[PDB]
Amino acid sequence: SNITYVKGNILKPKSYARILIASCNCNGSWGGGIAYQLALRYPKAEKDYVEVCEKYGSNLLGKCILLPSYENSDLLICCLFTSSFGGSSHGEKQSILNYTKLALDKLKTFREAIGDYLNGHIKYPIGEYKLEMPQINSGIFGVPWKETERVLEEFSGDMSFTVYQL
Numbered sequence: 562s563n564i565t566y567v568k569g570n571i572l573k574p575k576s577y578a579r580i581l582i583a584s585c586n587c588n589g590s591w592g593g594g595i596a597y598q599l600a601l602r603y604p605k606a607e608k609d610y611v612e613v614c615e616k617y618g619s620n621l622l623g624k625c626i627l628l629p630s631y632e633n634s635d636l637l638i639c640c641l642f643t644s645s646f647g648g649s650s651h652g653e654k655q656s657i658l659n660y661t662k663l664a665l666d667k668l669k670t671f672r673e674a675i676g677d678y679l680n681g682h683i684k685y686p687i688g689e690y691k692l693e694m695p696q697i698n699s700g701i702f703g704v705p706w707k708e709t710e711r712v713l714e715e716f717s718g719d720m721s722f723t724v725y726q727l
C-alpha cells in the first residue's frame with residue numbers, strides 16, 4: 562500500500578533527492594552486505610556512523626541517525642539502529658523488528674517537525690527526500706521480508722517507501 566517495489570540496485574544514481582534507509586548494528590561495523598557497499602562509496606558517512614556508535618554504542622537501539630553521503634548532495638543515509646552486533650551475533654528477530662519500528666518512528670517525527678550531522682550539508686527540506694531502502698533485515702539479520710514489510714505498512718498515511726529488490 563505505502564510500499565512501492567522496484568527492481569534493481571539501490572546505489573545506481575537517481576536524479577531526485579533521497580534518503581537511503583539501512584538497518585545497522587550499534588558496534589560501528591559497516592562490515593558486510595549493503596553497509597559495506599555504503600562504506601566503500603561514502604567513507605565520510607561511515608566515519609560519522611562509527612563516531613556515533615563509539616559515543617553511544619548499544620544505547621542507540623531503536624533510534625536512527627541521518628547522515629550526508631558527502632559524495633552526492635542528493636543522497637542521505639538513514640541508519641536504523643536495530644541490533645547490538647552485526648554478523649552471526651545479531652539480535653533476535655522480534656528485537657530487530659521492534660527496533661525497526663521505533664527507529665522508523667523517530668524518522669517520521671523528524672520529517673514532520675537524529676539530525677546533528679546534517680548541519681550545513683542538507684540541501685533541501687528534510688521532507689523533500691524520498692525514502693528508499695533495500696529489503697532491510699532480510700540478509701545478514703535473517704528476518705523474513707514479510708515481517709519487516711508489515712512494520713513498514715503500519716506507517717501507511719504517514720510515510721511512503723520505495724523498496725528495491727534485486
Ligand SMILES: Nc1ncnc2c1ncn2[C@@H]1O[C@H](COP(=O)(O)OP(=O)(O)OC[C@H]2O[C@@H](O)[C@H](O)[C@@H]2O)[C@@H](O)[C@H]1O
Pocket residue numbers: 569570571572583584585586590591592593594595596597598646647648695696697698699700701702703725726727
Ligand atoms: N545495492 C543493493 N541494492 C539493493 N538491494 C541490495 C543491495 N545490496 C544488498 N541488497 C539486498 O538487501 C538485503 C539486505 O542487505 P544486508 O546488508 O544483508 O542488510 P540486513 O539484512 O538489514 O543486515 C544488516 C547488517 O548487515 C549490514 O548491512 C549492517 O552492518 C548490519 O550489520 C540483501 O539480502 C540483499 O538482497
